[PDB]
DNA sequence: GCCCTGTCGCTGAGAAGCGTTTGCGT
DNA sequence: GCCCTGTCGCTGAGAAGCGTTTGCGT
């Protein structure tokens, strides 16, 4: 299988450092092929904090969104999403507008 | 990867025995977990001859249909499909009416 | 030029087959 | 009953991240 396992992170396990590491400008991202995480929207693998979809039916990394992409494409803040126990990713809500999902 | 490789069989390599082995009644199928092939429509893995999708963009076993399913669900004969160099499976044509594909 | 500082292309990827499985009531 | 002899449920499955990548011309 090519799919990375999806693990749901509880809201009470979100730390201050992770909140401070949410990207505020896409040009300031730090790339890392091993420790980074890929944002579903912009498809860049970087070390900034990204969202975690808490829908049990979600899979893979489709639920991971960076700071700028979540606010610019959906008007939501990553910090609010990380502290929301019922937050579902735009792919799970069927409203993703990335270049791949809006084709069909 | 869980996907079986898709191999396109040329029309000139279809033999008489394979044509004679096309299923004419679903109750007469012979099941075999190792040598059988799965029909996409009825999801039964049997030894009767099934279609081969010749679209290069096809993948997996979605293009394999048994005799009764092809004629009853799409009005096409497996023998005609096997001898058609440009035959595409109903999933490739977006007209599949199996229980999984017609949901969405 | 303006303010809200932003994004898509490409490769290879995209289940399969078991059990609980065989038409409609027009 | 009829003729054309038929089909769905369930489990686990359903990419990810590289390069060619950063708003519109209203
Ligand atoms: Mg391939
Ligand atoms: Mg069986
Ligand atoms: Mg009815
Ligand atoms: Mg799973
Ligand atoms: Mg790179
Ligand atoms: Mg324009
Ligand atoms: Zn992003
Ligand atoms: Zn999700
Ligand atoms: Zn998307
Ligand atoms: Zn079949
Ligand atoms: Zn096909
Ligand atoms: Zn189908």
PDB file of C-alpha atoms (C1' of nucleotides) and ligand atoms in Angstrom:
ATOM      1  CA  UNK A   1       0.000   0.000   0.000  1.00  0.00           C
ATOM      2  CA  UNK A   2       1.170   3.509  -0.901  1.00  0.00           C
ATOM      3  CA  UNK A   3      -1.063   5.149   1.731  1.00  0.00           C
ATOM      4  CA  UNK A   4       0.470   6.511   4.914  1.00  0.00           C
ATOM      5  CA  UNK A   5      -1.533   5.483   8.007  1.00  0.00           C
ATOM      6  CA  UNK A   6      -3.897   8.159   9.304  1.00  0.00           C
ATOM      7  CA  UNK A   7      -3.617   8.797  13.052  1.00  0.00           C
ATOM      8  CA  UNK A   8      -6.041  11.060  14.920  1.00  0.00           C
ATOM      9  CA  UNK A   9      -4.323  13.415  17.364  1.00  0.00           C
ATOM     10  CA  UNK A  10      -6.424  14.419  20.399  1.00  0.00           C
ATOM     11  CA  UNK A  11      -6.943  18.135  20.967  1.00  0.00           C
ATOM     12  CA  UNK A  12      -5.500  17.952  24.494  1.00  0.00           C
ATOM     13  CA  UNK A  13      -2.174  16.736  23.038  1.00  0.00           C
ATOM     14  CA  UNK A  14      -1.631  19.900  20.972  1.00  0.00           C
ATOM     15  CA  UNK A  15       1.256  21.903  22.428  1.00  0.00           C
ATOM     16  CA  UNK A  16       2.140  25.593  22.376  1.00  0.00           C
ATOM     17  CA  UNK A  17       5.228  25.016  20.219  1.00  0.00           C
ATOM     18  CA  UNK A  18       3.127  23.361  17.507  1.00  0.00           C
ATOM     19  CA  UNK A  19       0.734  26.329  17.516  1.00  0.00           C
ATOM     20  CA  UNK A  20       3.673  28.736  17.227  1.00  0.00           C
ATOM     21  CA  UNK A  21       5.038  26.674  14.309  1.00  0.00           C
ATOM     22  CA  UNK A  22       1.948  27.255  12.149  1.00  0.00           C
ATOM     23  CA  UNK A  23       3.104  28.884   8.921  1.00  0.00           C
ATOM     24  CA  UNK A  24       2.130  32.541   8.490  1.00  0.00           C
ATOM     25  CA  UNK A  25       3.718  33.127   5.057  1.00  0.00           C
ATOM     26  CA  UNK A  26       4.267  30.391   2.476  1.00  0.00           C
ATOM     27  CA  UNK A  27       7.622  31.875   1.431  1.00  0.00           C
ATOM     28  CA  UNK A  28       8.966  31.312   4.974  1.00  0.00           C
ATOM     29  CA  UNK A  29       8.482  27.528   4.962  1.00  0.00           C
ATOM     30  CA  UNK A  30      11.367  25.184   5.785  1.00  0.00           C
ATOM     31  CA  UNK A  31      11.549  22.111   3.554  1.00  0.00           C
ATOM     32  CA  UNK A  32      12.613  18.714   4.896  1.00  0.00           C
ATOM     33  CA  UNK A  33      12.161  15.459   2.990  1.00  0.00           C
ATOM     34  CA  UNK A  34      12.340  13.301   6.143  1.00  0.00           C
ATOM     35  CA  UNK A  35      10.803  15.325   8.992  1.00  0.00           C
ATOM     36  CA  UNK A  36       8.418  17.469   6.947  1.00  0.00           C
ATOM     37  CA  UNK A  37       4.732  16.957   6.269  1.00  0.00           C
ATOM     38  CA  UNK A  38       2.930  17.504   2.976  1.00  0.00           C
ATOM     39  CA  UNK A  39       0.083  19.994   2.667  1.00  0.00           C
ATOM     40  CA  UNK A  40      -2.704  18.570   0.509  1.00  0.00           C
ATOM     41  CA  UNK A  41      -3.468  21.942  -1.098  1.00  0.00           C
ATOM     42  CA  UNK A  42      -0.021  23.194  -2.161  1.00  0.00           C
ATOM     43  CA  UNK A  43       1.683  19.748  -2.147  1.00  0.00           C
ATOM     44  CA  UNK A  44       4.786  21.098  -0.359  1.00  0.00           C
ATOM     45  CA  UNK A  45       6.487  18.921   2.278  1.00  0.00           C
ATOM     46  CA  UNK A  46       7.626  21.276   5.043  1.00  0.00           C
ATOM     47  CA  UNK A  47       8.130  21.326   8.810  1.00  0.00           C
ATOM     48  CA  UNK A  48       5.401  23.819   9.730  1.00  0.00           C
ATOM     49  CA  UNK A  49       2.410  22.610  11.723  1.00  0.00           C
ATOM     50  CA  UNK A  50      -0.519  21.366   9.641  1.00  0.00           C
ATOM     51  CA  UNK A  51      -4.089  20.301  10.320  1.00  0.00           C
ATOM     52  CA  UNK A  52      -5.113  16.814  11.451  1.00  0.00           C
ATOM     53  CA  UNK A  53      -8.438  15.464  10.206  1.00  0.00           C
ATOM     54  CA  UNK A  54     -10.341  13.798  13.046  1.00  0.00           C
ATOM     55  CA  UNK A  55     -12.827  11.918  10.862  1.00  0.00           C
ATOM     56  CA  UNK A  56     -12.221   8.177  11.441  1.00  0.00           C
ATOM     57  CA  UNK A  57     -13.168   7.504   7.804  1.00  0.00           C
ATOM     58  CA  UNK A  58     -10.351   9.735   6.534  1.00  0.00           C
ATOM     59  CA  UNK A  59      -7.148   8.191   5.212  1.00  0.00           C
ATOM     60  CA  UNK A  60      -3.669   9.179   4.127  1.00  0.00           C
ATOM     61  CA  UNK A  61      -2.484  12.786   4.189  1.00  0.00           C
ATOM     62  CA  UNK A  62      -5.487  14.359   2.433  1.00  0.00           C
ATOM     63  CA  UNK A  63      -6.421  15.986   5.756  1.00  0.00           C
ATOM     64  CA  UNK A  64      -3.141  17.901   6.190  1.00  0.00           C
ATOM     65  CA  UNK A  65      -3.288  21.613   5.326  1.00  0.00           C
ATOM     66  CA  UNK A  66      -0.762  24.352   6.025  1.00  0.00           C
ATOM     67  CA  UNK A  67      -1.521  27.742   7.541  1.00  0.00           C
ATOM     68  CA  UNK A  68      -1.677  29.926   4.424  1.00  0.00           C
ATOM     69  CA  UNK A  69      -3.578  27.350   2.357  1.00  0.00           C
ATOM     70  CA  UNK A  70      -6.290  26.800   4.970  1.00  0.00           C
ATOM     71  CA  UNK A  71      -6.927  30.517   5.506  1.00  0.00           C
ATOM     72  CA  UNK A  72      -6.605  31.580   1.855  1.00  0.00           C
ATOM     73  CA  UNK A  73      -8.585  28.709   0.301  1.00  0.00           C
ATOM     74  CA  UNK A  74     -11.179  27.992   3.012  1.00  0.00           C
ATOM     75  CA  UNK A  75     -11.166  30.909   5.477  1.00  0.00           C
ATOM     76  CA  UNK A  76     -10.199  28.727   8.446  1.00  0.00           C
ATOM     77  CA  UNK A  77      -7.300  28.919  10.891  1.00  0.00           C
ATOM     78  CA  UNK A  78      -5.096  25.897  11.556  1.00  0.00           C
ATOM     79  CA  UNK A  79      -5.049  26.732  15.272  1.00  0.00           C
ATOM     80  CA  UNK A  80      -8.851  26.554  15.410  1.00  0.00           C
ATOM     81  CA  UNK A  81      -8.825  23.286  13.448  1.00  0.00           C
ATOM     82  CA  UNK A  82      -6.227  21.712  15.754  1.00  0.00           C
ATOM     83  CA  UNK A  83      -8.324  22.578  18.826  1.00  0.00           C
ATOM     84  CA  UNK A  84     -11.599  21.401  17.244  1.00  0.00           C
ATOM     85  CA  UNK A  85     -12.302  17.758  18.209  1.00  0.00           C
ATOM     86  CA  UNK A  86     -14.866  17.419  15.385  1.00  0.00           C
ATOM     87  CA  UNK A  87     -12.903  19.122  12.596  1.00  0.00           C
ATOM     88  CA  UNK A  88     -13.087  17.421   9.192  1.00  0.00           C
ATOM     89  CA  UNK A  89     -10.806  18.230   6.273  1.00  0.00           C
ATOM     90  CA  UNK A  90     -12.220  19.882   3.124  1.00  0.00           C
ATOM     91  CA  UNK A  91     -11.769  16.598   1.208  1.00  0.00           C
ATOM     92  CA  UNK A  92     -13.939  14.884   3.832  1.00  0.00           C
ATOM     93  CA  UNK A  93     -16.508  17.682   3.485  1.00  0.00           C
ATOM     94  CA  UNK A  94     -16.305  17.425  -0.319  1.00  0.00           C
ATOM     95  CA  UNK A  95     -15.397  21.101  -0.714  1.00  0.00           C
ATOM     96  CA  UNK A  96     -11.700  20.845  -1.566  1.00  0.00           C
ATOM     97  CA  UNK A  97     -10.724  23.308  -4.304  1.00  0.00           C
ATOM     98  CA  UNK A  98      -7.170  22.144  -4.973  1.00  0.00           C
ATOM     99  CA  UNK A  99      -6.073  21.659  -8.578  1.00  0.00           C
ATOM    100  CA  UNK A 100      -6.653  17.907  -8.390  1.00  0.00           C
ATOM    101  CA  UNK A 101      -9.991  17.750  -6.539  1.00  0.00           C
ATOM    102  CA  UNK A 102     -11.789  20.522  -8.452  1.00  0.00           C
ATOM    103  CA  UNK A 103     -11.244  18.696 -11.757  1.00  0.00           C
ATOM    104  CA  UNK A 104     -14.053  16.268 -10.885  1.00  0.00           C
TER     105      UNK A 104
ATOM    106  CA  UNK B   1       0.319  -1.745  -4.020  1.00  0.00           C
ATOM    107  CA  UNK B   2      -2.883  -3.803  -3.910  1.00  0.00           C
ATOM    108  CA  UNK B   3      -3.513  -3.397  -7.657  1.00  0.00           C
ATOM    109  CA  UNK B   4      -2.881  -6.306  -9.998  1.00  0.00           C
ATOM    110  CA  UNK B   5      -0.955  -5.223 -13.120  1.00  0.00           C
ATOM    111  CA  UNK B   6      -3.128  -4.656 -16.184  1.00  0.00           C
ATOM    112  CA  UNK B   7      -1.863  -6.399 -19.330  1.00  0.00           C
ATOM    113  CA  UNK B   8      -3.426  -5.812 -22.751  1.00  0.00           C
ATOM    114  CA  UNK B   9      -3.956  -9.016 -24.733  1.00  0.00           C
ATOM    115  CA  UNK B  10      -3.825  -8.613 -28.535  1.00  0.00           C
ATOM    116  CA  UNK B  11      -6.859  -9.790 -30.486  1.00  0.00           C
ATOM    117  CA  UNK B  12      -4.755 -12.141 -32.632  1.00  0.00           C
ATOM    118  CA  UNK B  13      -3.716 -14.044 -29.476  1.00  0.00           C
ATOM    119  CA  UNK B  14      -7.294 -15.040 -28.593  1.00  0.00           C
ATOM    120  CA  UNK B  15      -7.748 -18.781 -29.101  1.00  0.00           C
ATOM    121  CA  UNK B  16     -10.766 -20.947 -29.879  1.00  0.00           C
ATOM    122  CA  UNK B  17     -10.652 -22.657 -26.475  1.00  0.00           C
ATOM    123  CA  UNK B  18     -10.927 -19.304 -24.689  1.00  0.00           C
ATOM    124  CA  UNK B  19     -13.960 -18.395 -26.811  1.00  0.00           C
ATOM    125  CA  UNK B  20     -15.569 -21.753 -26.004  1.00  0.00           C
ATOM    126  CA  UNK B  21     -14.886 -21.154 -22.289  1.00  0.00           C
ATOM    127  CA  UNK B  22     -17.025 -17.999 -22.165  1.00  0.00           C
ATOM    128  CA  UNK B  23     -19.704 -18.540 -19.531  1.00  0.00           C
ATOM    129  CA  UNK B  24     -23.247 -18.968 -20.859  1.00  0.00           C
ATOM    130  CA  UNK B  25     -25.038 -19.410 -17.504  1.00  0.00           C
ATOM    131  CA  UNK B  26     -23.783 -17.963 -14.221  1.00  0.00           C
ATOM    132  CA  UNK B  27     -24.867 -21.069 -12.291  1.00  0.00           C
ATOM    133  CA  UNK B  28     -22.450 -23.194 -14.370  1.00  0.00           C
ATOM    134  CA  UNK B  29     -19.300 -21.315 -13.320  1.00  0.00           C
ATOM    135  CA  UNK B  30     -16.313 -23.167 -11.856  1.00  0.00           C
ATOM    136  CA  UNK B  31     -14.680 -21.391  -8.917  1.00  0.00           C
ATOM    137  CA  UNK B  32     -10.915 -21.445  -8.379  1.00  0.00           C
ATOM    138  CA  UNK B  33      -9.101 -19.163  -5.942  1.00  0.00           C
ATOM    139  CA  UNK B  34      -5.732 -19.541  -7.713  1.00  0.00           C
ATOM    140  CA  UNK B  35      -6.449 -19.954 -11.440  1.00  0.00           C
ATOM    141  CA  UNK B  36      -9.735 -18.045 -11.604  1.00  0.00           C
ATOM    142  CA  UNK B  37     -10.361 -14.452 -12.606  1.00  0.00           C
ATOM    143  CA  UNK B  38     -12.741 -12.010 -10.941  1.00  0.00           C
ATOM    144  CA  UNK B  39     -15.605 -10.420 -12.856  1.00  0.00           C
ATOM    145  CA  UNK B  40     -15.957  -6.752 -11.921  1.00  0.00           C
ATOM    146  CA  UNK B  41     -19.765  -6.857 -12.094  1.00  0.00           C
ATOM    147  CA  UNK B  42     -20.639  -9.948 -10.030  1.00  0.00           C
ATOM    148  CA  UNK B  43     -17.324 -10.089  -8.089  1.00  0.00           C
ATOM    149  CA  UNK B  44     -17.016 -13.875  -8.548  1.00  0.00           C
ATOM    150  CA  UNK B  45     -13.564 -15.381  -9.178  1.00  0.00           C
ATOM    151  CA  UNK B  46     -14.061 -18.195 -11.693  1.00  0.00           C
ATOM    152  CA  UNK B  47     -12.237 -19.909 -14.553  1.00  0.00           C
ATOM    153  CA  UNK B  48     -14.504 -18.832 -17.420  1.00  0.00           C
ATOM    154  CA  UNK B  49     -13.137 -16.462 -20.045  1.00  0.00           C
ATOM    155  CA  UNK B  50     -13.639 -12.767 -19.299  1.00  0.00           C
ATOM    156  CA  UNK B  51     -13.130  -9.514 -21.170  1.00  0.00           C
ATOM    157  CA  UNK B  52      -9.810  -7.667 -21.407  1.00  0.00           C
ATOM    158  CA  UNK B  53      -9.909  -3.872 -21.495  1.00  0.00           C
ATOM    159  CA  UNK B  54      -7.531  -2.544 -24.151  1.00  0.00           C
ATOM    160  CA  UNK B  55      -7.444   1.050 -22.901  1.00  0.00           C
ATOM    161  CA  UNK B  56      -3.833   1.778 -21.837  1.00  0.00           C
ATOM    162  CA  UNK B  57      -5.151   4.069 -19.083  1.00  0.00           C
ATOM    163  CA  UNK B  58      -7.092   1.212 -17.471  1.00  0.00           C
ATOM    164  CA  UNK B  59      -5.734  -0.504 -14.373  1.00  0.00           C
ATOM    165  CA  UNK B  60      -6.384  -3.513 -12.186  1.00  0.00           C
ATOM    166  CA  UNK B  61      -9.216  -5.943 -12.890  1.00  0.00           C
ATOM    167  CA  UNK B  62     -12.001  -3.380 -13.388  1.00  0.00           C
ATOM    168  CA  UNK B  63     -12.033  -4.317 -17.087  1.00  0.00           C
ATOM    169  CA  UNK B  64     -12.810  -8.021 -16.546  1.00  0.00           C
ATOM    170  CA  UNK B  65     -16.436  -9.036 -17.152  1.00  0.00           C
ATOM    171  CA  UNK B  66     -17.950 -12.498 -17.457  1.00  0.00           C
ATOM    172  CA  UNK B  67     -20.308 -13.661 -20.187  1.00  0.00           C
ATOM    173  CA  UNK B  68     -23.678 -13.325 -18.443  1.00  0.00           C
ATOM    174  CA  UNK B  69     -22.818 -10.005 -16.781  1.00  0.00           C
ATOM    175  CA  UNK B  70     -21.671  -8.337 -20.004  1.00  0.00           C
ATOM    176  CA  UNK B  71     -24.745  -9.402 -21.986  1.00  0.00           C
ATOM    177  CA  UNK B  72     -27.305  -8.866 -19.206  1.00  0.00           C
ATOM    178  CA  UNK B  73     -25.967  -5.536 -17.902  1.00  0.00           C
ATOM    179  CA  UNK B  74     -24.607  -3.937 -21.094  1.00  0.00           C
ATOM    180  CA  UNK B  75     -25.957  -5.899 -24.079  1.00  0.00           C
ATOM    181  CA  UNK B  76     -22.493  -6.883 -25.323  1.00  0.00           C
ATOM    182  CA  UNK B  77     -20.925 -10.268 -26.027  1.00  0.00           C
ATOM    183  CA  UNK B  78     -17.566 -11.220 -24.526  1.00  0.00           C
ATOM    184  CA  UNK B  79     -16.534 -12.827 -27.822  1.00  0.00           C
ATOM    185  CA  UNK B  80     -17.088  -9.536 -29.657  1.00  0.00           C
ATOM    186  CA  UNK B  81     -15.193  -7.641 -26.946  1.00  0.00           C
ATOM    187  CA  UNK B  82     -12.231 -10.039 -27.087  1.00  0.00           C
ATOM    188  CA  UNK B  83     -11.962  -9.600 -30.870  1.00  0.00           C
ATOM    189  CA  UNK B  84     -12.357  -5.800 -30.718  1.00  0.00           C
ATOM    190  CA  UNK B  85      -8.915  -4.114 -30.616  1.00  0.00           C
ATOM    191  CA  UNK B  86     -10.468  -0.833 -29.396  1.00  0.00           C
ATOM    192  CA  UNK B  87     -12.840  -2.244 -26.766  1.00  0.00           C
ATOM    193  CA  UNK B  88     -13.010  -0.290 -23.500  1.00  0.00           C
ATOM    194  CA  UNK B  89     -14.610  -1.585 -20.316  1.00  0.00           C
ATOM    195  CA  UNK B  90     -17.793   0.048 -18.957  1.00  0.00           C
ATOM    196  CA  UNK B  91     -15.776   1.569 -16.080  1.00  0.00           C
ATOM    197  CA  UNK B  92     -13.514   3.217 -18.668  1.00  0.00           C
ATOM    198  CA  UNK B  93     -16.604   4.461 -20.525  1.00  0.00           C
ATOM    199  CA  UNK B  94     -18.124   5.660 -17.234  1.00  0.00           C
ATOM    200  CA  UNK B  95     -21.285   3.594 -17.717  1.00  0.00           C
ATOM    201  CA  UNK B  96     -20.713   0.800 -15.202  1.00  0.00           C
ATOM    202  CA  UNK B  97     -23.915  -0.072 -13.331  1.00  0.00           C
ATOM    203  CA  UNK B  98     -22.506  -2.455 -10.729  1.00  0.00           C
ATOM    204  CA  UNK B  99     -23.556  -2.004  -7.106  1.00  0.00           C
ATOM    205  CA  UNK B 100     -20.360  -0.122  -6.275  1.00  0.00           C
ATOM    206  CA  UNK B 101     -20.035   2.189  -9.299  1.00  0.00           C
ATOM    207  CA  UNK B 102     -23.680   3.307  -9.507  1.00  0.00           C
ATOM    208  CA  UNK B 103     -23.548   4.649  -5.938  1.00  0.00           C
ATOM    209  CA  UNK B 104     -21.623   7.708  -7.154  1.00  0.00           C
TER     210      UNK B 104
ATOM    211  C1'  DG C   1      -1.593  48.590 -11.091  1.00  0.00           C
ATOM    212  C1'  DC C   2      -3.813  46.877  -6.298  1.00  0.00           C
ATOM    213  C1'  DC C   3      -4.081  44.319  -1.412  1.00  0.00           C
ATOM    214  C1'  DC C   4      -5.821  40.222   0.836  1.00  0.00           C
ATOM    215  C1'  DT C   5       1.101  38.043  -0.122  1.00  0.00           C
ATOM    216  C1'  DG C   6      -1.176  34.362  -3.124  1.00  0.00           C
ATOM    217  C1'  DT C   7       0.087  28.308  -6.748  1.00  0.00           C
ATOM    218  C1'  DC C   8      -0.143  24.187 -10.547  1.00  0.00           C
ATOM    219  C1'  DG C   9       2.414  20.315 -13.355  1.00  0.00           C
ATOM    220  C1'  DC C  10       4.093  15.711 -13.432  1.00  0.00           C
ATOM    221  C1'  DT C  11       4.970  10.716 -12.240  1.00  0.00           C
ATOM    222  C1'  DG C  12       2.737   6.898 -10.937  1.00  0.00           C
ATOM    223  C1'  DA C  13      -1.059   6.148  -8.553  1.00  0.00           C
ATOM    224  C1'  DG C  14      -5.788   4.799  -8.614  1.00  0.00           C
ATOM    225  C1'  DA C  15      -7.893  -3.644  -4.501  1.00  0.00           C
ATOM    226  C1'  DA C  16      -9.648  -7.650  -4.984  1.00  0.00           C
ATOM    227  C1'  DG C  17     -12.453 -11.383  -3.777  1.00  0.00           C
ATOM    228  C1'  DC C  18     -14.270 -13.298   0.067  1.00  0.00           C
ATOM    229  C1'  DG C  19     -19.295 -14.388   1.987  1.00  0.00           C
ATOM    230  C1'  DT C  20     -23.764 -12.698   3.684  1.00  0.00           C
ATOM    231  C1'  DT C  21     -24.473 -13.313  -3.510  1.00  0.00           C
ATOM    232  C1'  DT C  22     -28.610 -14.213  -8.632  1.00  0.00           C
ATOM    233  C1'  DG C  23     -34.304 -11.110 -12.341  1.00  0.00           C
ATOM    234  C1'  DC C  24     -39.493  -8.128 -11.096  1.00  0.00           C
ATOM    235  C1'  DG C  25     -43.676  -7.347  -7.465  1.00  0.00           C
ATOM    236  C1'  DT C  26     -43.989  -2.492 -13.464  1.00  0.00           C
TER     237       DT C  26
ATOM    238  C1'  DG D   1     -46.977 -15.399 -11.970  1.00  0.00           C
ATOM    239  C1'  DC D   2     -43.710 -14.436 -16.354  1.00  0.00           C
ATOM    240  C1'  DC D   3     -39.275 -14.854 -19.618  1.00  0.00           C
ATOM    241  C1'  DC D   4     -35.053 -12.532 -20.900  1.00  0.00           C
ATOM    242  C1'  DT D   5     -32.222 -17.321 -16.143  1.00  0.00           C
ATOM    243  C1'  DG D   6     -30.927 -12.939 -13.523  1.00  0.00           C
ATOM    244  C1'  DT D   7     -27.163 -10.477  -7.942  1.00  0.00           C
ATOM    245  C1'  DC D   8     -25.447  -7.418  -3.564  1.00  0.00           C
ATOM    246  C1'  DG D   9     -22.914  -7.183   1.227  1.00  0.00           C
ATOM    247  C1'  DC D  10     -18.652  -6.825   3.618  1.00  0.00           C
ATOM    248  C1'  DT D  11     -13.620  -6.052   4.727  1.00  0.00           C
ATOM    249  C1'  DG D  12     -10.181  -3.096   3.894  1.00  0.00           C
ATOM    250  C1'  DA D  13      -9.190  -0.341   0.418  1.00  0.00           C
ATOM    251  C1'  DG D  14      -9.020   4.265  -1.297  1.00  0.00           C
ATOM    252  C1'  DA D  15      -0.261   7.953  -2.819  1.00  0.00           C
ATOM    253  C1'  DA D  16       2.600  11.168  -1.905  1.00  0.00           C
ATOM    254  C1'  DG D  17       5.806  14.616  -2.955  1.00  0.00           C
ATOM    255  C1'  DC D  18       8.884  15.629  -6.309  1.00  0.00           C
ATOM    256  C1'  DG D  19       9.700  19.727  -9.868  1.00  0.00           C
ATOM    257  C1'  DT D  20       8.135  22.349 -13.915  1.00  0.00           C
ATOM    258  C1'  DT D  21       5.148  25.605  -8.160  1.00  0.00           C
ATOM    259  C1'  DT D  22       2.681  31.224  -5.610  1.00  0.00           C
ATOM    260  C1'  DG D  23      -2.881  36.164  -6.285  1.00  0.00           C
ATOM    261  C1'  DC D  24      -5.916  39.058 -10.733  1.00  0.00           C
ATOM    262  C1'  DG D  25      -5.735  41.138 -15.923  1.00  0.00           C
ATOM    263  C1'  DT D  26     -12.784  41.543 -12.791  1.00  0.00           C
TER     264       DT D  26
HETATM  265 MG1  LIG E   1       0.767   2.168 -13.951  1.00  0.00          MG
HETATM  266 MG1  LIG E   2     -16.369 -18.661  -1.876  1.00  0.00          MG
HETATM  267 MG1  LIG E   3     -40.291  -3.202  -6.764  1.00  0.00          MG
HETATM  268 MG1  LIG E   4      -7.927   1.431   7.019  1.00  0.00          MG
HETATM  269 MG1  LIG E   5      12.158  20.153  -3.908  1.00  0.00          MG
HETATM  270 MG1  LIG E   6      -8.283  36.394 -16.298  1.00  0.00          MG
HETATM  271 ZN1  LIG E   7      -0.405  24.501   1.623  1.00  0.00          ZN
HETATM  272 ZN1  LIG E   8     -10.469  14.005   6.275  1.00  0.00          ZN
HETATM  273 ZN1  LIG E   9      -7.913  18.332  -2.868  1.00  0.00          ZN
HETATM  274 ZN1  LIG E  10     -20.068 -11.388 -13.740  1.00  0.00          ZN
HETATM  275 ZN1  LIG E  11     -10.908  -0.246 -18.744  1.00  0.00          ZN
HETATM  276 ZN1  LIG E  12     -18.393  -1.051 -11.522  1.00  0.00          ZN
END
